[PDB]
Ligand binder design. Structure first.
Ligand code: NHW
Ligand code: 9K2
Ligand code: CL
Ligand code: MG
Length: 385
């Protein structure tokens, strides 16, 4: 297609290909003093709104907008239903700015109809660490689609990020845009087989009857790593060294400070689950997965698919297969129906043996204002929510 908005932006054109000797901005020597001070103009009757995600009621508003209008699969069966507490965690990480949590209201009803957000993160791309904004939760109400609101939201957050002297961004989407640095398919491991069959997500056939499908996905309720336990505050330093070390191998990863490790990993029920194996007061292995339910549209029996999404997993005392087998069992113990992972890091290597199935699409990783070589998803070492 044309990408008439995206081609005005500092991102690669559809045919751009850079070798590994190239790792730099499209536009360098930017000047904070030159950034527009005026808000981008919205159509008549709509206004910017600065959301306070720590206020329950403003946070409820964002929650309702996403619950009704956020991402669906291509068949419009499932819609992501991030919980309000999950949105609080995702948006209030260390050094967050309230002014990068941007809503648009329709003045006559006072209702929120659009949203976009960013948080700051140090991102290492091909061994250069850059202060960036991670952009997420871009949403326009279903009644106002294809009216070119989204570029307004994007330009307005880019302006507010640039005020902080930040000139690069990282973002992910299932849709193809100019132009991915990497592309990772997702895979799903069934936990509650029967439920997934009954809502249409998984299938039977003359060979695979219901009883046989259930048996296929049965797991033993005993951990490979016996001492794996919920992460506690005392474990923050050990997680930071274990994970920090591990992530240096990849082409793309966040550089976490200790404060970021406590925020992104300390457990919160129905939001983030992290488990650790401690030997001698050292953290030797970790598992983590976050909770992202999908609302089920038009199923008479079920309204919610409870799904655990693999986050960061590191083993030094087991095989990666054994670690991920434990991650599936811990998701099962926590009532999840399915365990979802992308082919990033070492994940793809355990998919066949641990009975994952290939999904319907892929997640694309993108950088704004950064020119570099693209790479296979095994070299991606970051997971965005
Ligand atoms: C230095 C700092 C830099 C900061 C900024 C970094 C960049 C951040 C970029 C954002 C990253 C967010 C990451 C993220 O949140 C995670 S990906 C999830 C995005 N959210 C949804 O999918 C929710 C359901 N859909 C919608 O709400 C609407 O369809 C949205 C709002 C998606 C588009 O609204 P619409 O009513 O359907 O469409 P128009 O207003 O008419 O706009 C059409 C223009 O929007 C382009 N478009 C469509 N989807 C996009 C997507 N997912 N990223 C970027 N661009 C997207 C499209 O290519 C077109 O441009 P083109 O004509 O050139 O092709
Ligand atoms: C289905 C799935 C499975 C999986 F294991 C990992 C990711 C996805 C998925 C696909 C499309 C998406 N669009 N936006 C999001 C939310 N963020 C990542 C921004 C998103 C996530
Ligand atoms: Cl403009
Ligand atoms: Mg629109």
């Amino acid at each position: 297609i044309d990408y008439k908005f995206w081609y005005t932006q500092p991102v690669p054109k559809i045919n751009d290909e850079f070798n590994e000797s190239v790792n730099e901005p499209f536009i360098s020597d930017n000047k904070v003093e030159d950034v527009r001070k005026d808000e981008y103009k919205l159509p008549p009757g709509y206004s910017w709104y600065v959301c306070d995600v720590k206020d329950e009621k403003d946070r409820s508003e964002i929650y309702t907008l996403l619950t009704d209008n956020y991402v669906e699969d291509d068949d419009n069966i499932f819609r992501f239903n991030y919980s309000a507490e999950f949105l609080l965690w995702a948006l209030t990480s260390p050094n967050y700015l309230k002014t990068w949590h941007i809503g648009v209201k329709y003045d006559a009803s006072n209702k929120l109809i659009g949203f976009i957000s960013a948080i700051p993160t140090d991102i290492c791309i091909h061994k250069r660490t850059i202060k960036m904004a991670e952009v997420n939760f871009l949403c326009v109400h279903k009644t106002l689609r294809s009216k070119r609101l989204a570029p307004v939201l994007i330009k307005e957050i880019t302006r507010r990020i640039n005020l902080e002297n930040i000139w690069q961004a990282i973002y992910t989407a299932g849709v193809y845009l100019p132009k991915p640095v990497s592309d990772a398919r997702y895979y799903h491991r069934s936990i509650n087989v029967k439920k997934l069959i009954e809502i249409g997500f998984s299938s039977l056939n003359s060979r695979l009857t219901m009883s046989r499908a259930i048996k296929l996905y049965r797991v033993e309720d005993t951990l490979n790593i016996k001492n794996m336990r919920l992460m506690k505050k005392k474990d923050v330093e050990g997680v930071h060294k274990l994970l920090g070390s591990y992530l240096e191998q990849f082409n793309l990863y966040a550089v976490f400070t200790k404060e970021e490790i406590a925020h992104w990993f300390l457990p919160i029920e129905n939001v983030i689950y992290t488990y650790v194996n401690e030997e001698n007061g050292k953290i030797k292995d970790m598992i983590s997965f976050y909770s992202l339910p999908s609302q089920i549209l038009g199923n008479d029996k079920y309204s919610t698919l409870n799904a655990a999404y693999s986050f960061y997993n590191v083993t030094t005392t087991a095989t990666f297969k054994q670690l991920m087998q434990d991650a599936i069992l811990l998701a099962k113990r926590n009532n999840f129906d399915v365990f979802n992972a992308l082919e990033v890091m070492q994940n793809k290597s355990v998919f066949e043996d641990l009975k994952f199935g290939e999904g319907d699409g892929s997640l694309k990783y993108y950088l704004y204002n950064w020119k570099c070589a693209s790479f296979a998803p095994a070299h991606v070492g970051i997971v965005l929510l």
